[model samples]
Target chain A: SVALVPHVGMGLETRTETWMSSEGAWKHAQRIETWILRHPGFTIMAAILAYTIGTTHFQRALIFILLTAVAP
Target chain B: SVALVPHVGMGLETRTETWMSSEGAWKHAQRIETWILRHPGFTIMAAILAYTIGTTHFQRALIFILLTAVAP
Candidate 1:
């Protein structure tokens, strides 16, 4: 398996900067983006399907509780 | 490459039912979901990245026009 890079607090900016600094990584990332653009519906549907399957009732309950705490 | 399934109007329901009715399909789908749940952060990051790169200036302009037509 490839090493998984961990991004700490500065990840929001620094992590993206790291990717942009790498020619190959950025190129591969752009390739994927281009493919997704050509298949937006598939990309969107896959995300939705993954979300639906992954969010079990327990997770939904936690989300509900979190929303209750945060929402007015 | 695997065949890409197109979902028309009733596909929203029928497609899901078809997957569920297939033991192997549903099992494989659940396996993917389980993997994603274990890597939720990665999944979220990838989806966001895909969206950011795929929405180029041209597409964004079209989206802006569509939103302008619909929004108050």
Candidate 2:
């Protein structure tokens, strides 16, 4: 994920440098980091959701919801 | 990863508010988020390990070790 960040950052910086500036690049990185930090539970939930859905298909969404609800 | 932070923040806030304070809570949130952003590769590696181990059990440990060693 960290690797992805720098790549994403570089991509953004390259594409938007005219408008974003160096300060904007830094702010974008900081914002992305903060966004990740603010939502660990949601991240886990999304991962579990993706894993479960990918493995079980849509047939198990209800079960997934129930199990996640009861999860810690 | 990102979503997990807030849930953890909430958990920490609930448990530590008496001693930690709201400012501390904000700091804690910031700290947790920073940690996630800085270690994205490690997080993905861990997930890969867990997935490989859980799926293959003990028999594939050696294979997993070798594969991860060469993984980017």
Candidate 3:
């Protein structure tokens, strides 16, 4: 993630302002972007959260609807 | 995960048109659902493709954009 960049992949950041401008809208966005790149934890946790929630919803919604439809 | 549906889950198909209708819109979805239940390959391959493609794009886009912003 943060350090794996040279390998060719997505990540949180390459960090350091050396290659970046002093200030601007893009730079502002980069601040958040760079830290995300620096920590990789954010991306991993977010990915796990999404995968579970999405899979859970896909499972429950259909069954619950069918069960309710049967009861009444 | 197919028979596991009797336990709990999502899949290609439960097959057998008995618990299903003779024919109609809902039944049509069931045919796809049942077949999908019968063959999980489609779901597995599609998942890998999406996961890889999305991560790749998330990586390349930033570098390409930054290079453009700096070059000219």
Candidate 4:
């Protein structure tokens, strides 16, 4: 579920900005970007997983099982 | 809602793969990470909710609100 975790993490990061001041939000996004960079593997993994899984149709079930097991 | 419906369905599948055929948008991004691992509960509710919004200041509030509902 590492992949799932990253997506959730990204979502959480985004939602946090919703209630922040404009400047705060931008700074927050920058922080999130930095955060992601700190975990480059997670970001790349999430992106690849998103790119791969987002595009498929039937093979999703297998990937889900795999990701669920790996997520923190 | 539904976590802003997967970021507008991944921006309409990346504007439909920027409008196709990069190997079918990488299998539609692996079918949206296998449809987000078969429902991970709004991906942790938009990550802490900075945790998820992804927009900026001076944007249309109404649009954001409409998106506020269950997007999926």
lDDT of the candidates, in the order given: 0.39, 0.44, 0.37, 0.38
Candidate number with the higher lDDT (2 or 3): 2
Query: Candidate 4 lDDT, tens digit per residue, B1-72?
Result: 122112222224433445325554364346555655765665445343422232332122322322222221
Provide the global lDDT of candidate 1 against the true structure: 0.39
Per-residue lDDT over B1-72 for candidate 3, one digit per residue giving the tens place of the 0 to 100 score: 112112112245556544434443264345445545755665565455435433344423432322222211
Please give the ranking of all candidate structures by TM-score, highest first, separated by commas.
Answer: 4, 1, 2, 3
What's each prediction's TM-score?
A: 0.25, 0.25, 0.22, 0.25
lDDT of model 1 at position A59: 33
* Fnat score for model 2: 0.00
Worst window of 10 by summed lDDT in candidate 4 chain A: A1-10
Which regions in candidate 3 have their CA more than 4 angstroms from the true location? A1-72, B1-22, B55-72
Error of 1 at B47 (Å): 22
Question: What does candidate 2's lDDT look like per residue over A3-55, in tens digits?
Answer: 22223323343443465357545764465457557556765775575355433
| Clashes per candidate (backbone, < 3 Å) | 0, 12, 11, 51
For model 2 chain A, the run of ten residues with the poorest summed lDDT: A1-10
Superposed on all Cα atoms, the candidates' RMSDs to the truth, in angstroms, are: 16.8, 16.1, 21.9, 18.6
Candidate 4: stretches off by over 4 Å: A1-22, A56-72, B1-72
